[PDB]
């Protein structure tokens, strides 16, 4: 019943006589599938969970320095060298300084000056590869006919409630069966292998901050980086070398780039971590649904004979359907809820079609809540629910 209200809702109807029905489940999107002599069920892909992530390349966004040293030489005497140029935790640079009597040299020209500083990273970020093999799609299934508004937002007690069930499909087990009680069972043949190439992206992990970025963007970061599991390349990105009157050289780090990245990431898809497994908020999934084993529930029931009471205001949805919350004080339940529209109260001709196919009440106890969906025809009609002299009637109009 969770498709009621979302804008990205598609109503698919297979060809007459065909057996196969294909659907595409998107994040935030909802597909309401119908079939002749089959129940209307809503299936939505809620969360995508990727496991077994491993390190690829880590960028540093905050570094630290210590132990700076210098060395100078006279003009045309060659370049200056220090032993830590072969030390990979140090970053050096040779420059040209004017040398003479005041500096202590006897020649005409520039003298080479080299200065090194110990490299150390204070706060760093990590990019991790997303393997389509270790990838999990979690699907939730929800059926119409029962499960009033109180079941829309309810996540505790899903192991005990038979109407709601959690589905998980990975490339290791592409098939799963939903125990659906009275409505039978639905098949779910999904294609995670041909749904979306998630191989061209990286999963970045900042200081407890997590995003989904292009792999083109990740290798273009002008910052110190190291691959896999430390050997840092491209040290020059974070360090400034100040020239001091062409005699000595000082080294300073640049401020923290944590904020500069957060601004540039404007547009990137965010994610969060459920401990060690990371969940996503984007991506689609193609599935194939079985209509053979999926059955109705209540076609042999008689019409609900006891009276009905409008408990809440009947409202309309984004697609033209009408839902109503009502109270059935009767005890002859389970009973088939009488629902149809009529444009003429004298002919009482059943026009249109029920969206929630064969809405049924389950409990024989009074003061129970129930909601159903209706599809009126274009133009004038009247929502008439119930039968006999205790049926309740409501006004409605289309377009």
């Amino acid at each position, epitope marked *: 019943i969770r498709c009621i209200g979302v804008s990205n809702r598609d109503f698919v109807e297979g060809m007459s006589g065909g057996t196969w029905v294909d659907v595409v489940l998107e994040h935030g999107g909802c597909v309401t599938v119908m079939a002749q002599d089959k129940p209307t069920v809503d299936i939505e892909l809620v969360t995508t969970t990727v496991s077994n992530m491993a390190e690829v390349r880590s960028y540093c966004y905050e570094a630290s320095i210590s132990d700076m040293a210098s060395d100078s030489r006279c003009p045309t005497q060659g370049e200056a060298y220090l032993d830590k140029q072969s030390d990979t935790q140090y970053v050096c640079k040779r420059t040209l300084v004017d040398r003479g009597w005041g500096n202590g040299c006897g020649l005409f020209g520039k003298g080479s000056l080299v200065t090194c500083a110990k490299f150390a990273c204070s706060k760093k970020m990590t990019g991790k590869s997303i393997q389509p093999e270790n990838l999990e799609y979690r699907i939730m299934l929800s059926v119409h006919g029962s499960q009033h508004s109180g079941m829309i937002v309810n996540d505790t007690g899903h192991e005990t409630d038979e109407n709601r069930a959690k589905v998980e499909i990975t490339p290791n087990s592409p098939r799963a069966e939903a125990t659906l009680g*009275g409505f039978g069972s639905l098949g779910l043949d999904c294609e995670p292998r041909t749904g979306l190439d998630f191989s061209d992206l990286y999963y970045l992990t900042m200081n407890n901050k997590h995003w989904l970025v292009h792999k083109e963007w990740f290798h273009d970061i002008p910052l110190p980086w190291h691959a896999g599991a430390p050997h840092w390349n491209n040290k020059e990105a974070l360090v400034e070398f100040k020239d001091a009157h062409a005699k000595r050289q000082t080294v300073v780090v640049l401020g923290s780039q944590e904020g500069a990245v957060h601004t540039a990431l404007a547009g990137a898809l965010e994610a969060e971590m459920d401990g060690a497994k990371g969940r996503l908020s984007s991506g689609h999934l193609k599935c194939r649904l079985k209509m053979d*084993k999926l059955r109705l529930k209540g*076609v042999s029931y008689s019409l609900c004979t006891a009276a009905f009471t409008f408990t809440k205001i009947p409202a309309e949805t984004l697609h033209g359907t009408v839902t109503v919350e009502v109270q059935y004080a009767g*005890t*002859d339940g389970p009973c088939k809820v009488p629902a149809q529209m009529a444009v003429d109260m004298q002919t009482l001709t059943p026009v249109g079609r029920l969206i929630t196919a064969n809405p049924v009440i389950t409990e024989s106890t009074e003061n129970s809540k129930m909601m159903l969906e209706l599809d009126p025809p274009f133009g004038d009609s009247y929502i008439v629910i119930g039968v006999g002299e205790k049926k309740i009637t409501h006004h409605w109009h289309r377009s």
Partner: antibody
Amino acid sequence: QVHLQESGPGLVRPSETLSLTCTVSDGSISSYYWSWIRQPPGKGLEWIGSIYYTGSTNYNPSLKSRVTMSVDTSKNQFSLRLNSVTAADTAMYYCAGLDRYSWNEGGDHWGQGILVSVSS
Amino acid sequence: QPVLTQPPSASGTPGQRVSISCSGSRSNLGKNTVNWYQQLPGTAPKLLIYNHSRRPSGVPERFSGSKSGTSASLAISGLQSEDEADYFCAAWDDSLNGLYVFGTGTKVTVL
């Protein structure tokens, strides 16, 4: 025209296996919660156990100690095994498709019944 | 399992109306269906009422059932001498795995 009919040894030795099968005709074996019931003369009826066509296994808590039930989806049949039978288990056995949720027109359905005795 | 207590012997002359009680617990009648059976000796009980007073073709209109919160009743209008038998009420229970429990049984006898 659906019809249920028991079939099996009407007399067995004690401590043996009480095996009973029941074939369903003109009907889907996937359309019911196929079950077994018993009734000793004088006492009340005792429901033996249920099994669903997918393999959903359900036993009587009072009889789950020595009940093993099987169902063949191909042959449209379902079977029953009872090891370590006592003389007190002399009852009249019926195969029936019980409707766990009462969703089917006509409701439950019953066979003709077989009275089984054990001689020691 | 709270045992269902029923009176053992019910009697009455021809032409009278006799109702049969069937009281259960929250686990069984509060969520499931109620069925009635007429037991004849030496044979299997035959389905009279299933799913709140519907009867398959062949069961007369004279029979009618009714369910309450935790108790069930069967009304026998137009009693006949051919109706002298034991009657059991059976209903599903939503206990450990889902059980089908029968009633204790009541002897009905015409004078």
